[PDB]
Design a protein around this nucleic acid. Structure first.
Ligand SMILES: [K+]
Ligand SMILES: [Mg+2]
Ligand SMILES: [Mg+2]
Ligand SMILES: [Mg+2]
Ligand SMILES: [Mg+2]
Ligand SMILES: [Mg+2]
Ligand SMILES: [Mg+2]
Lengths: 112, 216, 122, 121, 103, 34
RNA sequence: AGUACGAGAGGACCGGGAUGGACAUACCUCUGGUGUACCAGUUGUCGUGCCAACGGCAUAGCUGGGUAGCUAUGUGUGGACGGGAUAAGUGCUGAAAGCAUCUAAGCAUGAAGCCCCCCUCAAGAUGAGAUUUCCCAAUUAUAAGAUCCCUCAAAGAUGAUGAGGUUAAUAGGUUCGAGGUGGAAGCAUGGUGACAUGUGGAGCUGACGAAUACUAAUCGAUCGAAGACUUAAU
RNA sequence: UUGGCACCUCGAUGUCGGCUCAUCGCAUCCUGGGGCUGUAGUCGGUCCCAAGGGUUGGGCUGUUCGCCCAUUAAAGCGGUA
């Protein structure tokens, strides 16, 4: 198994579930904790459970385990992690508050 | 089941497969022999009487326990042995097996089994009431004369006696304790050693008693 | 270790700088807390201009200690000060940007949002 | 070892240094049992420096042996330090340790204390 | 440790003869392998040697570093399999054998 | 902390059963001067 | 396991673990605390008309560290499940009075509670038990067998328990190792100098380990059994 | 519990809280069984069986008690000069 052969599938169920600015970052020459990140955001409190409840299955297709869904019920910022891919499900505006992309502005990024 | 006797030697550690540390004691177990198989028709219980360490033979001006005596010597050679120092009976073990005069090898213990250990404690002399039973000590400033002492003992002119199961000073130490459900790590055969995960009672050079667990 | 009437510090961009511990969230008469532990605090010193003023009770999380943690591989890690980070109802941080390292034990502690943001994990 | 003898450190370190010296001069003394099971050791570690005889041992054969006692044997004068490396060392050049010998006399009158002799061999 | 030699014999095939030498105050690097999944990477720790005790399998040391203002320390066993290698790259002079004046 | 009664003549003497002394050894008279 | 059930959302039964808080017990391999006969550093003043290499007292003269040993804030187990029945409460045949009905002749059911299962002490249990082997007379000596007495701790207020007594490795010492300190003295190069380098991971080392009869466990004394009687079977 | 009576004790029965220790009782605060209902589900409410074990740290005034922030499966009422 390998990561780069597993991120075109990672952008899959989040454009299926109609994610927006669904970009992806890498951390090869950055960090030693996780390879690549994926990012998104969503509008409605209803709309934020289905984006990531899907990812539960899609990790069971390759049969990699999931360990936590933080703020899932609260439905504000949610994080399913895999040590190679991460699904940061955001809100319409909290994306701007934390502003992920510019902390790691020095990130080779790719749009999808 | 199965049971072997031996001496506690020391304590060290080993590295597992995942580099994890596992702490271990080191049990030596040589020269065990069976000396009397039992019966229900005679005693009322089946068992296996076993003896562990060798000693010397009868002597005329004999003034130790190194050199054996005649009643002992008349019990070793019966089952074709030498005089044995320590003796114990094991009662929870199958008796159709274990013929007489043989030896008992550590090899009957695999690595990864489960056991329970039984031995003596260490000696503390005449000790108080808060090292022993472990209970609160009193103030040391603000004008106080109660520091390390057992406060009260009774109530009043009702129940003017003092009940029996009461906590006072005295002696704690060489009592019989057991430990349940430890693990077998590794089993040498030449040096005749068995290793156990965890620490077990007694002092060094003491005596240890090993047996299979009964629980699930 | 972190117990009642203990003064940690703060390592986030949320105004509160120093705090005072007054509880630990176990419950059977618990009397300490190490890394990975949700607690209750107040503030005793802030910065002018921010989002968490002085006199506000809040819950908070450890990230560093003088006493370390006993890794199962037979390894130990002890820092040279203490530190804390302030959180919210949604199990996530008040501010945004983390300062100073943290400890890897926070990955299996559902604090992945904070390793998601911090310079040096170690 | 490890005996205190009802005498605190600063006192015991000076009582065991007088015993080691006055013994050597007369080779035979009369003490209680306990003390002579402790100069059983201090003085046996003190000939083992006298067989070397080097310049360094004389420097550690003075940090326990006692101040220069101007002896007077037959028409002479010595020091307890130019008697220990010249004379005892030469008698005892071919044995191993064990050159002391304890001997039990009776008790005393006043305090009821076992009395023993100690000499060299 | 020749007591009766039964403990320093069993614990013989858990040693390793791969590791260079080092006294206190001798900078060196430490290539751990860290397992957080099906397979994971290395993540060096670098620093300066302050402590070393013991003998046998239970022989330890520790190293100090500063990292973005804060100090940190990690102490390791010498014979564990995690530690791929050790790389001593500098050497010094001191008069102590436990170093704590570094805080 | 103070005696409430008198001690009889018996209880005084039932108590001194063990309040005696002992004998030396006997080597041929010669002392056991090991 | 979103299945029984729930108007759907919600939600068990089932039964699987994973990780914990308080509490109770053994231990010292790790992390750490002490360590007053161990190792370096360092000020003041007395002792050698001084060189400082040494000692004494000044909280152990102060400071940095620390072996054996006892310790927790450290290191590992434990709580039981499982069964025998019993409260309320669920029932079935079944009479009462046809039918009825859980109690009346009957009879399954079912609570962390109760006795049994797990750990510890126990035959002065005068109801004083059960095996195994060893010892056997001319009041009377003495046998198996123990105690006095001397060397010591894995034990210990004192008694007692335990290891060993010259066919002997018990404690000490001597010769080798470990762990700890952190590079002696003394000569030799370099610096005007106080200093730093090299000969040399040096030298010293209390309590832990081994080997070795050089010292002493000498000498010698004292207690100590000789199977009753019927009434049966032999 | 506030009391009534004045039977022992005045040639001495010599003291309200809190600290240290513990011990019994249920008319049960939590856990454990169940019945009942408007308990659809949850959440309860009500009465029934049950004492094996369990039952928190701190601020103000003397504080016995009282009020208040903060946690907890729960933060029990009475006896024993
Ligand atoms: K208080
Ligand atoms: Mg006073
Ligand atoms: Mg005598
Ligand atoms: Mg003076
Ligand atoms: Mg009244
Ligand atoms: Mg009244
Ligand atoms: Mg009247």
């Amino acid at each position: 198994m390998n990561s780069q052969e597993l991120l075109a599938i990672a952008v899959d169920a989040i454009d299926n579930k109609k994610g927006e600015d669904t970009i992806s970052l890498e951390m090869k020459g950055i960090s030693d904790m996780t390879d690549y990140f994926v990012v998104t955001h969503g509008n409605n409190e209803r709309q934020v459970q289905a984006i990531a409840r899907a990812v539960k299955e899609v990790a069971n297709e390759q049969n990699i385990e999931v360990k936590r869904m933080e703020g899932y019920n609260e439905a504000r910022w949610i994080l399913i992690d895999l040590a190679d891919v991460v699904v940061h499900v955001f809100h319409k505006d909290e994306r701007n508050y934390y502003n992920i992309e510019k902390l790691y502005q020095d990130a080779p990024l790719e749009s999808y | 089941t199965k049971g072997i006797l031996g001496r506690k030697i020391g304590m060290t550690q080993v590295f597992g497969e995942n580099g994890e540390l596992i702490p271990v004691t080191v049990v030596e177990a040589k020269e065990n022999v069976v000396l009397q198989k039992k019966t229900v028709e005679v005693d009322g219980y089946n068992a296996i009487q076993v003896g562990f360490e060798d000693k010397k033979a009868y002597k005329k001006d004999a003034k130790s326990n190194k050199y054996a005596n005649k009643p002992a010597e008349g019990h070793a050679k019966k089952a074709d042995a030498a005089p044995k120092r320590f003796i114990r009976e094991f009662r929870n073990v199958d008796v159709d097996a274990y013929e007489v005069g043989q030896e008992v090898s550590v090899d009957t213990f695999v690595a990864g089994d489960v056991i329970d250990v039984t031995g003596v404690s260490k000696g503390k002399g005449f000790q108080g009431a808060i090292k022993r039973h472990g209970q609160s000590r009193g103030p040391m400033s603000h004008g106080s004369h109660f520091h390390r002492a057992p406060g009260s003992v009774g109530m009043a002119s009702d129940a003017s006696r003092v009940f029996k199961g009461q906590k006072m000073p005295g002696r704690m130490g060489g009592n019989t304790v057991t430990v349940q459900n430890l693990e077998v790590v590794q089993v040498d055969t030449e040096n005749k050693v068995i290793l156990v995960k965890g620490n077990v009672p007694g002092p060094k050079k003491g005596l240890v008693e090993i047996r299979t667990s009964i629980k699930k | 270790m972190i117990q009642q009437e203990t003064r940690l510090k703060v390592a986030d961009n949320s105004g509160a700088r120093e705090v005072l511990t007054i509880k630990v969230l176990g419950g059977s008469g618990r009397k300490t807390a190490n890394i990975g532990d949700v607690i209750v605090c107040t503030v005793k010193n802030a910065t002018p201009g921010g989002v968490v003023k002085k006199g506000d009770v809040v819950k908070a999380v450890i990230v560093r200690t003088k006493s370390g943690v006993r890794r199962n591989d037979g390894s130990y890690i002890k820092f040279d000060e203490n530190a804390c980070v302030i959180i919210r109802d949604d199990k996530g941080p008040r501010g945004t940007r983390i300062f100073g390292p943290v400890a890897r034990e926070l990955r299996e502690g559902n604090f992945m949002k904070i390793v998601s943001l911090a310079p040096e994990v170690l | 070892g490890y005996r205190k003898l009802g005498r605190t450190s600063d006192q015991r370190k000076a009582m065991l240094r007088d015993l080691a010296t006055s013994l050597i001069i007369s080779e035979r003394i009369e003490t209680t049992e306990a003390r002579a099971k402790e100069v059983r050791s201090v003085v046996e570690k003190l000939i083992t420096l006298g067989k070397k005889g080097d310049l360094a041992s004389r420097r550690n054969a003075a940090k326990t042996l006692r101040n220069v006692e101007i002896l007077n044997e037959d028409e002479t004068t010595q020091t307890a330090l130019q008697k220990l490396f010249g004379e005892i060392a030469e008698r005892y050049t071919e044995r191993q340790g064990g050159y002391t010998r304890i001997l039990k006399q009776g008790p005393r009158r006043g305090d009821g204390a076992e009395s023993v002799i100690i000499e060299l061999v | 440790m020749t007591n009766h030699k039964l403990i320093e014999a069993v614990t013989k095939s858990q040693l390793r003869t791969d590791l260079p030498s080092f006294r206190p105050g001798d900078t060196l690097r430490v290539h751990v392998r860290i397992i957080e999944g099906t397979r994971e990477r290395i993540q060096v720790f670098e620093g300066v040697v302050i402590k070393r005790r013991g003998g046998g399998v239970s022989e330890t040391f520790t190293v100090r570093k500063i990292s973005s203002g804060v100090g940190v320390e990690r102490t390791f066993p010498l014979h564990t399999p995690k530690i791929e290698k050790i790389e001593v790259k500098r050497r010094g002079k001191v008069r102590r054998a436990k170093l704590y004046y570094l805080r | 902390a103070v005696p409430k009664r008198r001690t009889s003549k018996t209880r005084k003497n039932k108590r001194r059963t063990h309040f005696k002394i002992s004998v030396p050894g006997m080597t041929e008279e010669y002392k056991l001067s090991h």
